[PDB]
Structures are given as C-alpha cells and as structure tokens.
Amino acid sequence: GSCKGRCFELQEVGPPDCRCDNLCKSYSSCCHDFDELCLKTARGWECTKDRCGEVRNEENACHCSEDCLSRGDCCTNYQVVCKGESHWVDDDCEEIKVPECPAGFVRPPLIIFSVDGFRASYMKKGSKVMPNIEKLRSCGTHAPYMRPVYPTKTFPNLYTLATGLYPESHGIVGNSMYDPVFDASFHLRGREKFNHRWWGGQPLWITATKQGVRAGTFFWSVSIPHERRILTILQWLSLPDNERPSVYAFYSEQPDFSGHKYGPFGPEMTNPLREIDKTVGQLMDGLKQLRLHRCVNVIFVGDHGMEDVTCDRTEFLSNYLTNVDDITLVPGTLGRIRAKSINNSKYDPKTIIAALTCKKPDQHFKPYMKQHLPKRLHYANNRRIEDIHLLVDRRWHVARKPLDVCFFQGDHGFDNKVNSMQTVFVGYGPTFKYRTKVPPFENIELYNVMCDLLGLKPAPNNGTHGSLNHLLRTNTFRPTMPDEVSRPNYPGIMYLQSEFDLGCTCDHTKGSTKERHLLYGRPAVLYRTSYDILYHTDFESGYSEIFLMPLWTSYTISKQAEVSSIPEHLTNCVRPDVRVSPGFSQNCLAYKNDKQMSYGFLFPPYLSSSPEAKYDAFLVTNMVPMYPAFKRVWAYFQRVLVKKYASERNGVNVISGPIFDYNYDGLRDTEDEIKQYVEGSSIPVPTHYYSIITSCLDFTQPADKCDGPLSVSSFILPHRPDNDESCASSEDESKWVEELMKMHTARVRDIEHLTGLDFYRKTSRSYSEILTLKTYLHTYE
Ligand SMILES: *[C@@H]1O[C@H](CO)[C@@H](O[C@@H]2O[C@H](CO)[C@@H](O[C@@H]3O[C@H](CO[C@H]4O[C@H](CO[C@H]5O[C@H](CO)[C@@H](O)[C@H](O)[C@@H]5O[C@H]5O[C@H](CO)[C@@H](O)[C@H](O)[C@@H]5O)[C@@H](O)[C@H](O[C@H]5O[C@H](CO)[C@@H](O)[C@H](O)[C@@H]5O[C@H]5O[C@H](CO)[C@@H](O)[C@H](O)[C@@H]5O)[C@@H]4O)[C@@H](O)[C@H](O[C@H]4O[C@H](CO)[C@@H](O)[C@H](O)[C@@H]4O)[C@@H]3O)[C@H](O)[C@H]2NC(C)=O)[C@H](O)[C@H]1NC(C)=O
Ligand SMILES: C[C@H](CCC(=O)NCCS(=O)(=O)O)[C@H]1CC[C@H]2[C@@H]3[C@@H](O)C[C@@H]4C[C@H](O)CC[C@]4(C)[C@H]3CC[C@]12C
Ligand SMILES: [Ca+2]
Numbered sequence: 001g002s003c004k005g006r007c008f009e010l011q012e013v014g015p016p017d018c019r020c021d022n023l024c025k026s027y028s029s030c031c032h033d034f035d036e037l038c039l040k041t042a043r044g045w046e047c048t049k050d051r052c053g054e055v056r057n058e059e060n061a062c063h064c065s066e067d068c069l070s071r072g073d074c075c076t077n078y079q080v081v082c083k084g085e086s087h088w089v090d091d092d093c094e095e096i097k098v099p100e101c102p103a104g105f106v107r108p109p110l111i112i113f114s115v116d117g118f119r120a121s122y123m124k125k126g127s128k129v130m131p132n133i134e135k136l137r138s139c140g141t142h143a144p145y146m147r148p149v150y151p152t153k154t155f156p157n158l159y160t161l162a163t164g165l166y167p168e169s170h171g172i173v174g175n176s177m178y179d180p181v182f183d184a185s186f187h188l189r190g191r192e193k194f195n196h197r198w199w200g201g202q203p204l205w206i207t208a209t210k211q212g213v214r215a216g217t218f219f220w221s222v223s224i225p226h227e228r229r230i231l232t233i234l235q236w237l238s239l240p241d242n243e244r245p246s247v248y249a250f251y252s253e254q255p256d257f258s259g260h261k262y263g264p265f266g267p268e269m270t271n272p273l274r275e276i277d278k279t280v281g282q283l284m285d286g287l288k289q290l291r292l293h294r295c296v297n298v299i300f301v302g303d304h305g306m307e308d309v310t311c312d313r314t315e316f317l318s319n320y321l322t323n324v325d326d327i328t329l330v331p332g333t334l335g336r337i338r339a340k341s342i343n344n345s346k347y348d349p350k351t352i353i354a355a356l357t358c359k360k361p362d363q364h365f366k367p368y369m370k371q372h373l374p375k376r377l378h379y380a381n382n383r384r385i386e387d388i389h390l391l392v393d394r395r396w397h398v399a400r401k402p403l404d405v406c407f408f409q410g411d412h413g414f415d416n417k418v419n420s421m422q423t424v425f426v427g428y429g430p431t432f433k434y435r436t437k438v439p440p441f442e443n444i445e446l447y448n449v450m451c452d453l454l455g456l457k458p459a460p461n462n463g464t465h466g467s468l469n470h471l472l473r474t475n476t477f478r479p480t481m482p483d484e485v486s487r488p489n490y491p492g493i494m495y496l497q498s499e500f501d502l503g504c505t506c507d508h509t510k511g512s513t514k515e516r517h518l519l520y521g522r523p524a525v526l527y528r529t530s531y532d533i534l535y536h537t538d539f540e541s542g543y544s545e546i547f548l549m550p551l552w553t554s555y556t557i558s559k560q561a562e563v564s565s566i567p568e569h570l571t572n573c574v575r576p577d578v579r580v581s582p583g584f585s586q587n588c589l590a591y592k593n594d595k596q597m598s599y600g601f602l603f604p605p606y607l608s609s610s611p612e613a614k615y616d617a618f619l620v621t622n623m624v625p626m627y628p629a630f631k632r633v634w635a636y637f638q639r640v641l642v643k644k645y646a647s648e649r650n651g652v653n654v655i656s657g658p659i660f661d662y663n664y665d666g667l668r669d670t671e672d673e674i675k676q677y678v679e680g681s682s683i684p685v686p687t688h689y690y691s692i693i694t695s696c697l698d699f700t701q702p703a704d705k706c707d708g709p710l711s712v713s714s715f716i717l718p719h720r721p722d723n724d725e726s727c728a729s730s731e732d733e734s735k736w737v738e739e740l741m742k743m744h745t746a747r748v749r750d751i752e753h754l755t756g757l758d759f760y761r762k763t764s765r766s767y768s769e770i771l772t773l774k775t776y777l778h779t780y781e
C-alpha cells in the first residue's frame with residue numbers, strides 16, 4: 001500500500017502490509033512512497049519572513065501557514081519569525097513550581113536527549129558554544145559529571161541507561177561480543193543486533209507499555225536526518241489524548257565521531273558542539289511553540305567521555321605471546337581473549353596470563369582472569385565475557401599484532417573511574433529541581449528516576465531506589481529500610497577453657513562498647529543464619545557460627561590513638577572464646593596442616609588501647625584465614641594506613657569482614673557455593689576482604705561526635721595467594737599496597753550485595769541521604 005496518512009505511525013505493521021515507521025529503512029520494509037510522502041525536504045527546516053502566512057504546500061518539509069499550529073507541523077522557528085515570539089534560549093529562567101500542560105495531559109511527558117561521546121568537561125565551553133544546553137544546565141538540575149558503566153562504549157551504556165542494569169546482567173557486554181551457546185557474534189554493523197535474544201532485562205519502553213504508559217519509538221534509521229526526528233517528536237506530542245505517547249527519545253551520534261578523528265581537545269570539536277546545541281534549540285523552540293516548554297521533563301545525558309588516543313600508543317600481544325595466531329582478541333581500549341579454535345585442546349589460559357604479566361617496565365595493560373577484576377566494575381557474570389581480560393591504561397590501545405593497526409586521535413572504553421570517560425547529566429522540567437547542583441552519580445541509577453518521572457514501578461535493577469530522590473522536587477518513591485531477618489544471640493560465659501581442643505597456644509559493657517565502636521548502629525543480617533554479638537573494650541563483632549568467623553567487625557580509632565607492635569612472645573598466640581562453643585570455633589591445627597594458608601585478625605592487635613585489651617585481639621573468634629601473600633597487604637593496611645586515615649580525617653570508624661563470591665555474581669555465596677576450605681576443615685576461604693571507613697564530612701568534628709553528613713571510603717580487596725597483580729610488589733609495601741587498594745575501591749552498596757548486610761541503620765540522617773552515601777565511590781582521580 002501507501003504511507004499516505006501514516007508516516008512515522010506509532011504501531012509497527014505485520015508482515016502482510018508494508019511499513020511507514022521510524023525503522024522501516026533498517027529492516028528495508030518501507031512502502032514504495034515512503035520517501036516521497038514521509039521524507040520531504042523542500043525549503044529546509046526554517047521558516048523565513050516571506051513564507052509567513054503562506055498557503056499550505058504539501059511538498060514542504062515543514063510549514064509556515066496559519067493552520068500549522070493546529071496541525072502540529074510548523075517549522076520549529078515559525079512563532080519566532082512570523083509571530084514576534086522569542087527563542088526559548090533568550091527567555092529568563094523561571095522556576096517551574098508545577099507542570100503547566102494543556103488540559104487532557106495526565107502526566108508530564110519525559111524526553112530523553114542522548115549524546116554519544118560527550119565528555120563532562122565539554123560543559124566548560126559555556127554559553128559561547130552551547131547556549132541552549134547551558135540554559136538547561138544552569139536552570140535545571142545538574143551534576144559535575146556522571147559515571148558510565150564499564151566498558152565505556154556506546155551499546156553497553158545505552159542499554160544500561162535504558163534498563164538500570166550492569167552489562168553482565170542485561171547481556172550487551174560490548175559493541176562486539178561472541179556468545180558460545182548461540183555460537184554467533186554481535187557487532188554494531190550488521191543485522192545480528194536486531195535479534196531479541198541478545199537483549200535481556202526490561203528496558204524503559206517495555207516497562208512503560210506494560211503499565212499502560214505509551215512510548216514513542218526511541219530509534220531511527222540513520223538516513224532520517226535530525227531535523228525530521230525533532231519534528232516527528234513534536235508531531236507525536238500534538239496527537240489526541242488516547243494516542244499520544246508519554247515518553248520519547250532522541251539520540252545524537254555527535255560529538256563522538258569528531259572526537260575519534262580529532263581528539264577531545266581539538267579546535268575541531270567546536271562546530272559539532274554548536275550543531276548539537278542547534279538541535280536542542282529546535283526542540284525547545286518547538287516545545288515552546290506547542291506551550292509544552294514548562295510541561296515536559298527533559299534529560300540531557302551522555303553515554304561516555306573521550307580520551308587522547310593515537311595508533312603509535314598500541315601494545316602488541318605478538319611481543320608477549322609466541323603462538324599469537326592461536327587466539328582471538330577483542331582489541332582496543334580493552335582486551336578480551338579466547339581460543340581461536342574450540343578444537344584446540346592445547347590452549348591454556350594460565351600460560352597466556354603468565355606470559356602477559358609484568359614483562360615490560362612501561363607495560364600499558366594488565367591481564368586478569370575475569371573473576372579477579374575489581375568488583376566495582378561488575379564485569380564477570382556473563383558467558384559472553386571471556387575468561388581473560390586486559391585492562392588497558394588510559395591513552396593506549398592493545399592489538400594482537402602490528403599488521404592489525406593515523407586515522408584516529410580519540411577513543412574510549414577504559415575503566416569507568418578514569419576522568420576522561422566521565423559524561424554529562426542535566427534534568428530540566430517541573431519534576432526536577434530548580435538551579436540545583438547534585439553530586440556525581442552512576443548511570444545505573446537513572447532507570448529508577450525515569451520510572452518515577454513517569455509513575456512507573458521499576459523492574460528489578462542495579463540502581464538503589466531513593467539514592468537520587470534529591471534530584472527531584474516531588475517523589476513518587478519513599479524508600480523503606482529493609483527488615484532484619486536473623487536476630488542476633490548475645491551469649492554469656494558458657495564454656496570452660498579446658499573444654500577446648502583446638503590445638504592453639506598462647507603465652508554498661510555492651511553500652512560503652514556499642515557507643516564508642518558502633519557509631520551507626522548494628523548492621524542488619526538480611527538472610528537466615530546463626531550469629532552472636534561479641535563485645536570487647538576496643539571492638540565489637542557479629543560472629544557467624546556457620547562460617548566460623550565474623551561477618552563484620554566494627555571499631556573506632558581516634559586521631560590521638562597510638563600504634564603499638566605485636567610483642568615477640570605473642571606472635572603465635574590464639575585464644576579460645578569462652579562465649580562460643582568449641583564446635584562453632586576455628587582450630588589452629590587446620591592452619592598448621594594447610595601449607596599454603598596462614599591467618600590474620602579483623603580487629604588488629606597493633607591498634608589495641610592497652611596491653612590488657614590486646615589479648616582480646618588474639619581471640620579465635622577474631623581470626624580469619626589469610627594467604628601469606630595477602631598478609632603483606634593486610635598488615636600494611638592495619639599497621640600504617642588505618643592510623644594515617646584517623647590522622648587525616650579526625651578519627652575513623654572501621655567495619656571489616658570477609659566476602660565469599662566463588663561464582664562471581666556479586667552476591668553473597670551460600671554454603672553450597674563455597675569451593676575452598678582450610679585443608680581438612682570446615683573453615684571456608686574468603687575470596688575478598690572488605691573495609692568500610694567512615695568519618696564526619698566536616699573534619700573539624702571528630703568521627704564519634706559528628707552532627708552533620710558522613711564521609712565514607714570503602715574497598716573490596718581480592719584475597720589472592722600471590723601479588724602478581726602488583727608489578728612492584730618485591731619493593732617495600734609503601735611503594736605498592738595503597739595503589740592496589742585504590743584500584744579496588746568500592747561502594748558500601750557493593751559490599752552489601754556481597755555480604756547480605758545492611759549498614760548505617762542508626763544515624764541522625766534521612767534514609768535518602770544514607771542511600772546516597774551508600775552509592776558513593778571514592779575514585780582517587
Ligand atoms: C543486578 O540486578 C539484577 C536484576 O535484579 C540481578 O540479576 C538477577 O539475579 C537474580 C538472582 O541470581 C536472578 O534470579 C534468577 O532468575 C532465574 C530465572 O532467569 C530468567 O528469568 C529472569 C526473570 O525475568 C523477569 O524479571 C527480570 C528481573 O529479574 C526482568 O528484567 C525480565 O524482563 C523478566 O520480566 C518479566 O517478569 C517479571 C516478574 O518475574 C515482571 O515483573 C516483568 O514485568 C516481566 O513480565 C531473567 O532476569 C533472566 O535473565 C537472564 O537470563 C537471560 C537468558 O539467558 C539473559 O538474556 C538475561 O540478560 C539475564 O542474564 C543475567 O542473569 C543470569 C541469571 O539469571 C546470569 O546467568 C547471566 O549471565 C546474566 O547475568 C532469565 O530469563 C531463576 O531460575 C533463578 O532461580 C533459582 O535461584 C533462586 C535463588 O537465587 C531460587 O529462589 C530458585 O528456587 C532457583 O533455584 C533466580 O531467581 C535474575 O535472573 C537476575 N535478573 C537479571 C535481569 O539479570 C543482579 O543480581 C544484580 N546484581 C547485583 C550485583 O546486585
Ligand atoms: C540501537 C539499534 C539500532 C541502532 C543502529 O546503530 N542502527 C544501525 C543503522 S540502522 O540499521 O538502524 O539504520 C536499535 C534499532 C532497533 C532496536 C531493536 C528493536 O527493533 C527490536 C527489539 C526491541 C526490544 O525491546 C529490545 C531489543 C530490540 C532488538 C531492539 C534493540 C535496539 C535496536 C536494535
Ligand atoms: Ca556469589
């Protein structure tokens with residue numbers, strides 16, 4: 001048939017009839033007259049003086065006739081040129097206290113305006129280059145920058161924005177991927193991306209449709225120019241109440257292309273930024289023309305930043321591996337390695353990793369088995385993520401061999417904490433705040449916000465719902481603190497010293513402990529288990545009788561506190577805990593028989609308040625299994641760094657503990673999932689150790705008497721039997737441990753997922769502020 005009267009229709013027609021929608025050029029299914037009827041270009045996209053009040057001519061791309069406003073198809077500048085109206089950008093900021101929408105609108109619409117490769121620092125260029133974007137920014141709600149997901153590439157980030165999920169969960173783990181179950185590859189170029197099997201989770205357009213909220217088609221065939229896309233959105237916004245969508249999207253491919261060619265700081269970046277701003281200007285003028293400029297919520301959001309990268313900064317795997325033709329490399333600003341052929345039984349990942357580990361002094365990438373990547377990246381739990389991963393230094397590439405390789409000066413893809421990868425967020429409209437700055441946040445949080453903006457219930461996702469309530473004038477969501485599942489026991493003196501046969505040798509009480517050492521209340525255990533609260537002068541812990549060690553150990557170290565040494569006669573001291581059964585305690589004979597495994601302590605003897613109290617630090621209930629290699633890291637943290645942090649931050653409260661994540665899903669392991677124990681024992685081996693280090697944001701107040709907001713940094717250290725990750729680890733600990741720790745920085749939330757614990761349950765702060773605190777990441781950038 002014809003597309004007459006159905007150009008860019010909001011219902012995709014089945015395989016009997018031809019199509020007239022946004023994507024009919026991509027699946028080459030358009031009616032023969034789609035180009036003629038739906039892609040008119042005559043006289044361009046702007047009204048001029050001589051066209052004002054013209055008789056309508058159906059050949060024109062947009063109209064300047066008296067009927068155009070009623071028909072909803074004026075050029076965006078019609079009112080400005082023909083009716084003496086002002087451009088939206090020339091109007092003062094005026095607070096939008098309530099949505100001002102035409103009658104019949106049931107909710108404020110949401111428009112998502114996405115930009116590809118828009119570096120946070122581009123907003124520096126100001127009104128001189130981007131006057132419309134700068135008005136949105138300063139008038140609405142904005143962050144200094146927004147953290148994308150890893151890898152910092154287009155598709156993983158665009159689908160993360162839409163779903164609230166990590167790539168490991170939504171399935172778009174790269175612009176390129178191989179799936180070994182499908183035995184097929186996915187690429188930006190090609191038809192494979194159109195198959196539904198790749199795309200998991202529930203994107204916003206689906207959440208909307210399932211709950212009765214109609215969505216505009218988010219995507220366009222590339223041959224449809226930007227001006228037509230804006231006019232079509234404006235057209236859809238003029239439909240009747242029963243047909244009009246409530247959510248829309250526009251995606252710009254700029255300024256990515258120019259960034260790749262000229263680099264992020266080229267003079268050539270100005271015009272692409274002007275072009276995007278012009279497009280924003282057309283949307284805002286068009287909205288104003290329709291009287292929807294104080295009705296619609298607009299999000300201006302980037303997918304990632306852009307870095308200086310040239311082909312002369314390329315590492316080649318052929319300089320490291322002898323049999324480089326036996327492997328397949330996903331290359332560039334990250335590396336992923338698998339066997340070239342599945343028939344090759346000789347392929348060995350251990351050999352590959354070893355060959356790629358600390359071989360050149362300036363070496364500009366580092367290899368990892370995926371389960372050993374920093375947990376903050378959340379990049380492992382998907383069969384499309386190859387076992388071998390290369391984290392590449394900012395400014396560099398990795399390639400397989402030299403003949404694989406100047407056509408570019410910019411790239412992206414690196415670690416999402418790198419500054420050049422940070423991107424933009426602006427929220428403008430009745431539901432966002434007025435002239436408000438908010439702290440940097442992660443793009444995984446936006447799905448929840450977009451659902452709140454539309455009155456939708458979010459599908460289960462990786463955001464923390466409530467953590468961005470402070471972006472909004474009005475909230476449909478009020479978060480609730482979860483219910484504790486397991487109540488603690490508080491055991492007294494229940495057992496004799498001589499009743500222990502553990503092979504170990506050595507040469508209000510509640511109220512005082514709790515108020516000094518648990519500043520923010522007891523963590524809640526959100527799963528079914530059996531644990532005991534143990535009180536001591538210097539620290540408090542929740543001891544698990546199932547894992548035979550603390551789930552958490554909590555203590556406070558003032559700026560005045562003194563570092564002592566473990567005296568030589570107590571080096572091998574481990575003491576039984578009379579409150580805890582011998583059958584629910586560790587034993588020292590397990591450690592003697594296990595030739596690879598030693599032990600450490602969660603509360604450090606080095607920071608004990610007296611020689612008397614120090615004895616509690618050696619209790620069997622404060623003991624945890626530690627590889628000798630890891631003890632170098634842990635000893636340096638406890639002996640040197642905790643004190644240094646207390647000094648710099650005016651006291652710190654520390655909560656430390658074990659993490660078990662053998663299946664690398666970022667979630668607390670059950671007993672069944674633990675694959676390693678201290679030899680011949682029931683004592684499970686942690687994959688990581690965490691600490692959460694809290695103090696007062698106002699550091700002139702000490703940590704234990706803080707009136708206002710809190711300040712937190714945390715980490716999740718991998719519990720490794722070597723220090724191969726750290727190329728400088730033969731040197732003194734002062735030259736490498738802290739760099740290791742900063743690489744493994746983490747959010748409190750990451751620790752909560754991995755432990756099934758809920759922190760900060762008793763503070764003077766609102767729960768919404770606390771959720772914000774829990775999503776914070778200290779990046780060291
Ligand atoms: C980040 O946030 C994520 C989302 O909350 C967390 O990921 C979730 O993790 C849980 C716990 O492991 C996991 O639960 C398992 O689910 C198994 C069933 O798997 C299939 O179905 C689910 C459910 O689909 C529906 O709901 C999801 C939200 O979860 C929604 O996005 C879907 O569109 C769909 O919606 C429809 O239903 C809901 C109601 O149920 C309606 O509300 C809605 O309107 C819709 O009608 C899917 O999510 C699964 O998807 C995975 O697999 C497909 C196919 O391969 C992939 O394409 C997809 O990307 C996704 O892959 C990821 O997860 C799997 C694990 O499922 C990984 O292996 C993979 O590598 C990816 O990471 C499937 O289609 C279920 O069998 C299993 O049950 C068993 O274990 C539990 C105990 O845990 C026991 O209770 C049971 O008795 C069983 O023995 C378990 O329940 C979710 O599947 C998973 N969801 C997603 C989207 O990943 C993630 O943990 C979190 N991360 C962190 C660090 O916090
Ligand atoms: C981003 C992607 C296309 C962008 C692009 O670079 N195109 C290349 C040039 S051209 O061919 O488009 O002209 C969009 C277009 C259609 C979308 C797909 C839809 O059709 C059908 C599916 C809808 C589901 O809710 C999600 C997955 C699903 C498969 C969509 C995934 C995202 C899809 C594939
Ligand atoms: Ca796990």
Ligand code: NA
Nearest residue numbers: 591594597598
């Ligand atoms: Na040992």
Ligand code: NA
Nearest residue numbers: 723724726729
């Ligand atoms: Na090393």
Ligand SMILES: [Zn+2]
Nearest residue numbers: 116117154303
């Ligand atoms: Zn991009």
Ligand SMILES: [Zn+2]
Nearest residue numbers: 117256260412
């Ligand atoms: Zn790009």
